Amino acid sequence: QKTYQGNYGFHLGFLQSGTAKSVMCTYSPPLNKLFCQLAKTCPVQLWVSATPPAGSRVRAMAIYKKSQHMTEVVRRCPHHERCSDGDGLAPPQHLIRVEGNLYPEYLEDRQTFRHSVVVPYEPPEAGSEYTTIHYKYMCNSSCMGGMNRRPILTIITLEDSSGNLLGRDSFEVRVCACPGRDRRTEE
Ligand SMILES: [Zn+2]
């Protein structure tokens, strides 16, 4: 999916990580793909070249990468949906959750029925040039009944208070047991 830096120069950033066997979350710049373990927090950076209007929001949503599966809503597999690992905020069917934010909104589109999690857009902290949001994926890419080995993309959109699109940028994701190993291979 095409990126849209838009009027505010919106784009994502990821900390530099290696491919060590014990790494729990590692991003690959050449593949623009995030490799992470189940339920492990992944810090994603939000960069802008100009401050967005007040009341702006940041939405995260997963879609299947391959054309033939793109219309299918991405959800947790039945097994994980019933494992009772809820934090009291996120519905059990949602794949993506946010951690460390007091204002997450777990939404379900009234027309497409796709899931997403939204948090307020907040400026970078003192002496910082990016904002960090911590995301976690509650299902493995291999989960049958779920993503079933189908690659997904995580679309991050910057929206105004009215829900209008301001910016967009995405990355592929693979939720596996050994992020370090899989990254080097795919690379
Ligand atoms: Zn699962």
PDB file of C-alpha atoms and ligand atoms in Angstrom:
ATOM      1  CA  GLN A   1       0.000   0.000   0.000  1.00  0.00           C
ATOM      2  CA  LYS A   2       1.218   3.478  -0.973  1.00  0.00           C
ATOM      3  CA  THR A   3       2.450   5.741   1.801  1.00  0.00           C
ATOM      4  CA  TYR A   4       1.061   9.255   2.175  1.00  0.00           C
ATOM      5  CA  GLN A   5       3.385  11.610   4.008  1.00  0.00           C
ATOM      6  CA  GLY A   6       0.823  14.333   3.405  1.00  0.00           C
ATOM      7  CA  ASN A   7       1.048  17.961   4.498  1.00  0.00           C
ATOM      8  CA  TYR A   8       2.676  17.110   7.840  1.00  0.00           C
ATOM      9  CA  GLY A   9       5.459  14.871   6.524  1.00  0.00           C
ATOM     10  CA  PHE A  10       4.217  11.859   8.461  1.00  0.00           C
ATOM     11  CA  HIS A  11       6.286   8.658   8.456  1.00  0.00           C
ATOM     12  CA  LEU A  12       7.316   5.878  10.816  1.00  0.00           C
ATOM     13  CA  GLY A  13      10.660   4.998  12.334  1.00  0.00           C
ATOM     14  CA  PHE A  14      12.041   1.903  14.057  1.00  0.00           C
ATOM     15  CA  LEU A  15      14.958   1.478  16.457  1.00  0.00           C
ATOM     16  CA  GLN A  16      17.967  -0.278  14.959  1.00  0.00           C
ATOM     17  CA  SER A  17      17.963  -3.914  16.031  1.00  0.00           C
ATOM     18  CA  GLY A  18      20.005  -6.975  15.163  1.00  0.00           C
ATOM     19  CA  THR A  19      19.233 -10.530  14.123  1.00  0.00           C
ATOM     20  CA  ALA A  20      20.439 -12.213  17.310  1.00  0.00           C
ATOM     21  CA  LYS A  21      18.599 -15.429  18.112  1.00  0.00           C
ATOM     22  CA  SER A  22      17.270 -13.979  21.372  1.00  0.00           C
ATOM     23  CA  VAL A  23      16.001 -10.638  20.043  1.00  0.00           C
ATOM     24  CA  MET A  24      12.261 -10.337  20.758  1.00  0.00           C
ATOM     25  CA  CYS A  25      11.442  -7.542  18.317  1.00  0.00           C
ATOM     26  CA  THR A  26      13.492  -6.545  15.275  1.00  0.00           C
ATOM     27  CA  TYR A  27      12.772  -4.399  12.221  1.00  0.00           C
ATOM     28  CA  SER A  28      14.263  -4.950   8.761  1.00  0.00           C
ATOM     29  CA  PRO A  29      14.786  -1.731   6.744  1.00  0.00           C
ATOM     30  CA  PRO A  30      15.390  -3.460   3.369  1.00  0.00           C
ATOM     31  CA  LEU A  31      12.199  -5.520   3.742  1.00  0.00           C
ATOM     32  CA  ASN A  32      10.313  -2.789   5.652  1.00  0.00           C
ATOM     33  CA  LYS A  33       9.130  -5.645   7.815  1.00  0.00           C
ATOM     34  CA  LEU A  34       8.770  -6.051  11.561  1.00  0.00           C
ATOM     35  CA  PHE A  35       9.627  -9.410  13.112  1.00  0.00           C
ATOM     36  CA  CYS A  36       8.294  -9.905  16.628  1.00  0.00           C
ATOM     37  CA  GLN A  37       7.245 -12.447  19.222  1.00  0.00           C
ATOM     38  CA  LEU A  38       3.667 -13.016  20.340  1.00  0.00           C
ATOM     39  CA  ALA A  39       2.425 -10.307  22.714  1.00  0.00           C
ATOM     40  CA  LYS A  40       5.852  -8.618  22.800  1.00  0.00           C
ATOM     41  CA  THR A  41       5.798  -4.822  22.820  1.00  0.00           C
ATOM     42  CA  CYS A  42       7.096  -3.129  19.685  1.00  0.00           C
ATOM     43  CA  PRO A  43       8.006   0.570  19.939  1.00  0.00           C
ATOM     44  CA  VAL A  44       6.984   2.385  16.760  1.00  0.00           C
ATOM     45  CA  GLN A  45       8.155   5.945  16.133  1.00  0.00           C
ATOM     46  CA  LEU A  46       5.942   8.626  14.613  1.00  0.00           C
ATOM     47  CA  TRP A  47       7.789  11.388  12.756  1.00  0.00           C
ATOM     48  CA  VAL A  48       6.303  14.623  11.408  1.00  0.00           C
ATOM     49  CA  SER A  49       7.914  17.634   9.740  1.00  0.00           C
ATOM     50  CA  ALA A  50       5.217  19.936  11.133  1.00  0.00           C
ATOM     51  CA  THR A  51       2.891  19.700  14.140  1.00  0.00           C
ATOM     52  CA  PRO A  52      -0.543  18.235  13.266  1.00  0.00           C
ATOM     53  CA  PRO A  53      -3.709  20.088  14.365  1.00  0.00           C
ATOM     54  CA  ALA A  54      -4.857  19.620  17.955  1.00  0.00           C
ATOM     55  CA  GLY A  55      -7.062  16.613  18.553  1.00  0.00           C
ATOM     56  CA  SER A  56      -5.324  14.537  15.871  1.00  0.00           C
ATOM     57  CA  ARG A  57      -5.403  10.757  16.267  1.00  0.00           C
ATOM     58  CA  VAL A  58      -3.276   7.753  15.323  1.00  0.00           C
ATOM     59  CA  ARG A  59      -4.902   4.565  14.060  1.00  0.00           C
ATOM     60  CA  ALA A  60      -3.322   1.146  13.655  1.00  0.00           C
ATOM     61  CA  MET A  61      -4.978  -1.550  11.545  1.00  0.00           C
ATOM     62  CA  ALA A  62      -3.903  -4.854  10.027  1.00  0.00           C
ATOM     63  CA  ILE A  63      -4.757  -6.033   6.502  1.00  0.00           C
ATOM     64  CA  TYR A  64      -3.602  -9.072   4.540  1.00  0.00           C
ATOM     65  CA  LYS A  65      -0.773  -8.235   2.143  1.00  0.00           C
ATOM     66  CA  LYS A  66      -1.760 -10.533  -0.729  1.00  0.00           C
ATOM     67  CA  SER A  67      -4.469  -9.300  -3.101  1.00  0.00           C
ATOM     68  CA  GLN A  68      -6.572 -12.466  -2.843  1.00  0.00           C
ATOM     69  CA  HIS A  69      -6.883 -12.140   0.953  1.00  0.00           C
ATOM     70  CA  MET A  70      -6.967  -8.359   1.287  1.00  0.00           C
ATOM     71  CA  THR A  71     -10.774  -8.227   1.625  1.00  0.00           C
ATOM     72  CA  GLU A  72     -10.769 -10.613   4.598  1.00  0.00           C
ATOM     73  CA  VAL A  73     -10.808  -8.936   8.015  1.00  0.00           C
ATOM     74  CA  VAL A  74      -7.702  -9.669  10.089  1.00  0.00           C
ATOM     75  CA  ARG A  75      -8.614 -11.125  13.482  1.00  0.00           C
ATOM     76  CA  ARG A  76      -7.194 -13.362  16.204  1.00  0.00           C
ATOM     77  CA  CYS A  77      -7.737 -17.097  15.744  1.00  0.00           C
ATOM     78  CA  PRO A  78     -10.548 -18.722  17.792  1.00  0.00           C
ATOM     79  CA  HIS A  79      -8.067 -20.319  20.194  1.00  0.00           C
ATOM     80  CA  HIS A  80      -6.411 -17.050  21.211  1.00  0.00           C
ATOM     81  CA  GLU A  81      -9.683 -15.129  21.242  1.00  0.00           C
ATOM     82  CA  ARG A  82     -10.781 -17.487  24.034  1.00  0.00           C
ATOM     83  CA  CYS A  83      -7.540 -17.656  26.045  1.00  0.00           C
ATOM     84  CA  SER A  84      -8.679 -14.882  28.416  1.00  0.00           C
ATOM     85  CA  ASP A  85      -5.569 -12.686  28.106  1.00  0.00           C
ATOM     86  CA  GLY A  86      -7.575  -9.471  28.026  1.00  0.00           C
ATOM     87  CA  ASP A  87      -6.360  -6.299  29.709  1.00  0.00           C
ATOM     88  CA  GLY A  88      -9.902  -5.091  30.293  1.00  0.00           C
ATOM     89  CA  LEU A  89      -9.644  -2.576  27.446  1.00  0.00           C
ATOM     90  CA  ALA A  90      -9.112  -4.515  24.218  1.00  0.00           C
ATOM     91  CA  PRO A  91     -11.877  -6.764  22.822  1.00  0.00           C
ATOM     92  CA  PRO A  92     -10.663 -10.401  22.689  1.00  0.00           C
ATOM     93  CA  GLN A  93     -10.956 -10.547  18.886  1.00  0.00           C
ATOM     94  CA  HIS A  94      -8.492  -7.688  18.221  1.00  0.00           C
ATOM     95  CA  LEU A  95      -5.048  -8.657  16.908  1.00  0.00           C
ATOM     96  CA  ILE A  96      -3.339  -5.332  17.654  1.00  0.00           C
ATOM     97  CA  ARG A  97      -3.243  -3.749  21.095  1.00  0.00           C
ATOM     98  CA  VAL A  98      -1.461  -0.674  22.427  1.00  0.00           C
ATOM     99  CA  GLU A  99       0.450  -0.639  25.712  1.00  0.00           C
ATOM    100  CA  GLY A 100       1.480   2.312  27.879  1.00  0.00           C
ATOM    101  CA  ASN A 101      -1.344   4.581  26.735  1.00  0.00           C
ATOM    102  CA  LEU A 102      -4.269   5.596  28.948  1.00  0.00           C
ATOM    103  CA  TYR A 103      -6.544   6.487  26.029  1.00  0.00           C
ATOM    104  CA  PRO A 104      -6.770   3.599  23.573  1.00  0.00           C
ATOM    105  CA  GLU A 105      -9.950   3.184  21.534  1.00  0.00           C
ATOM    106  CA  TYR A 106     -10.657  -0.255  20.094  1.00  0.00           C
ATOM    107  CA  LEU A 107     -12.861   0.243  17.068  1.00  0.00           C
ATOM    108  CA  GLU A 108     -14.778  -1.793  14.520  1.00  0.00           C
ATOM    109  CA  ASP A 109     -15.728  -0.097  11.248  1.00  0.00           C
ATOM    110  CA  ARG A 110     -19.507   0.006  10.806  1.00  0.00           C
ATOM    111  CA  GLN A 111     -19.130  -0.745   7.079  1.00  0.00           C
ATOM    112  CA  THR A 112     -16.020  -2.907   6.631  1.00  0.00           C
ATOM    113  CA  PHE A 113     -16.066  -4.404  10.138  1.00  0.00           C
ATOM    114  CA  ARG A 114     -12.281  -4.219  10.242  1.00  0.00           C
ATOM    115  CA  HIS A 115     -10.698  -3.769  13.680  1.00  0.00           C
ATOM    116  CA  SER A 116      -8.325  -0.981  14.679  1.00  0.00           C
ATOM    117  CA  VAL A 117      -6.894   0.714  17.761  1.00  0.00           C
ATOM    118  CA  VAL A 118      -6.677   4.483  18.023  1.00  0.00           C
ATOM    119  CA  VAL A 119      -4.770   6.702  20.457  1.00  0.00           C
ATOM    120  CA  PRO A 120      -4.413  10.490  20.586  1.00  0.00           C
ATOM    121  CA  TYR A 121      -1.517  11.924  18.597  1.00  0.00           C
ATOM    122  CA  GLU A 122       0.902  13.518  21.076  1.00  0.00           C
ATOM    123  CA  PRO A 123       3.969  15.668  20.303  1.00  0.00           C
ATOM    124  CA  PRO A 124       7.479  14.324  21.016  1.00  0.00           C
ATOM    125  CA  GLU A 125       8.743  14.630  24.592  1.00  0.00           C
ATOM    126  CA  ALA A 126      11.234  17.340  25.585  1.00  0.00           C
ATOM    127  CA  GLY A 127      14.432  17.025  23.569  1.00  0.00           C
ATOM    128  CA  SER A 128      12.981  14.360  21.273  1.00  0.00           C
ATOM    129  CA  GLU A 129      11.970  14.542  17.604  1.00  0.00           C
ATOM    130  CA  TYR A 130       9.558  11.618  17.385  1.00  0.00           C
ATOM    131  CA  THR A 131       6.662  10.147  19.345  1.00  0.00           C
ATOM    132  CA  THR A 132       6.621   6.506  20.388  1.00  0.00           C
ATOM    133  CA  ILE A 133       3.615   4.202  20.505  1.00  0.00           C
ATOM    134  CA  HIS A 134       3.988   0.674  21.837  1.00  0.00           C
ATOM    135  CA  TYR A 135       2.077  -1.972  19.915  1.00  0.00           C
ATOM    136  CA  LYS A 136       1.728  -5.703  20.447  1.00  0.00           C
ATOM    137  CA  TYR A 137       0.308  -8.482  18.274  1.00  0.00           C
ATOM    138  CA  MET A 138      -1.810 -11.089  20.061  1.00  0.00           C
ATOM    139  CA  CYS A 139      -1.614 -13.849  17.438  1.00  0.00           C
ATOM    140  CA  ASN A 140       1.144 -15.666  15.547  1.00  0.00           C
ATOM    141  CA  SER A 141       1.362 -15.353  11.771  1.00  0.00           C
ATOM    142  CA  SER A 142       1.102 -19.158  11.702  1.00  0.00           C
ATOM    143  CA  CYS A 143      -2.150 -19.340  13.683  1.00  0.00           C
ATOM    144  CA  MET A 144      -4.607 -21.537  11.802  1.00  0.00           C
ATOM    145  CA  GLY A 145      -8.091 -20.059  11.904  1.00  0.00           C
ATOM    146  CA  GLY A 146      -6.307 -16.727  12.035  1.00  0.00           C
ATOM    147  CA  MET A 147      -3.664 -15.236   9.738  1.00  0.00           C
ATOM    148  CA  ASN A 148      -2.763 -18.837   8.850  1.00  0.00           C
ATOM    149  CA  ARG A 149       0.739 -18.031   7.573  1.00  0.00           C
ATOM    150  CA  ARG A 150      -0.592 -15.187   5.408  1.00  0.00           C
ATOM    151  CA  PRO A 151       1.545 -12.028   5.599  1.00  0.00           C
ATOM    152  CA  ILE A 152      -0.142  -8.886   6.914  1.00  0.00           C
ATOM    153  CA  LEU A 153       0.612  -5.189   6.762  1.00  0.00           C
ATOM    154  CA  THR A 154       0.096  -2.808   9.672  1.00  0.00           C
ATOM    155  CA  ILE A 155      -1.313   0.479   8.401  1.00  0.00           C
ATOM    156  CA  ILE A 156      -0.652   3.451  10.672  1.00  0.00           C
ATOM    157  CA  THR A 157      -2.741   6.495   9.861  1.00  0.00           C
ATOM    158  CA  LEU A 158      -2.601  10.030  11.234  1.00  0.00           C
ATOM    159  CA  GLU A 159      -6.112  11.491  11.250  1.00  0.00           C
ATOM    160  CA  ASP A 160      -7.641  14.794  12.274  1.00  0.00           C
ATOM    161  CA  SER A 161     -10.280  15.095  15.001  1.00  0.00           C
ATOM    162  CA  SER A 162     -12.978  14.495  12.389  1.00  0.00           C
ATOM    163  CA  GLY A 163     -11.385  11.277  11.150  1.00  0.00           C
ATOM    164  CA  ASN A 164     -10.046  12.750   7.904  1.00  0.00           C
ATOM    165  CA  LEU A 165      -6.801  11.259   6.601  1.00  0.00           C
ATOM    166  CA  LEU A 166      -3.716  13.396   7.280  1.00  0.00           C
ATOM    167  CA  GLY A 167      -0.939  10.869   6.715  1.00  0.00           C
ATOM    168  CA  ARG A 168      -0.249   7.166   6.284  1.00  0.00           C
ATOM    169  CA  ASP A 169       2.642   4.719   6.443  1.00  0.00           C
ATOM    170  CA  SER A 170       2.799   0.956   6.776  1.00  0.00           C
ATOM    171  CA  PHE A 171       5.048  -2.024   7.324  1.00  0.00           C
ATOM    172  CA  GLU A 172       4.839  -5.788   6.958  1.00  0.00           C
ATOM    173  CA  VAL A 173       4.660  -7.908  10.086  1.00  0.00           C
ATOM    174  CA  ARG A 174       5.563 -11.455  10.999  1.00  0.00           C
ATOM    175  CA  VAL A 175       4.676 -12.642  14.490  1.00  0.00           C
ATOM    176  CA  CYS A 176       6.940 -15.613  15.163  1.00  0.00           C
ATOM    177  CA  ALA A 177       8.886 -17.392  17.885  1.00  0.00           C
ATOM    178  CA  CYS A 178      12.335 -16.468  16.570  1.00  0.00           C
ATOM    179  CA  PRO A 179      12.257 -12.931  15.067  1.00  0.00           C
ATOM    180  CA  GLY A 180      16.036 -12.762  14.771  1.00  0.00           C
ATOM    181  CA  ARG A 181      16.339 -15.966  12.759  1.00  0.00           C
ATOM    182  CA  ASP A 182      13.427 -15.281  10.412  1.00  0.00           C
ATOM    183  CA  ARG A 183      14.672 -11.778   9.625  1.00  0.00           C
ATOM    184  CA  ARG A 184      18.097 -12.915   8.415  1.00  0.00           C
ATOM    185  CA  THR A 185      16.577 -15.672   6.289  1.00  0.00           C
ATOM    186  CA  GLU A 186      13.970 -13.466   4.608  1.00  0.00           C
ATOM    187  CA  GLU A 187      16.713 -10.878   4.118  1.00  0.00           C
TER     188      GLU A 187
HETATM  189 ZN    ZN B   1      -3.771 -17.182  17.394  1.00  0.00          ZN
END
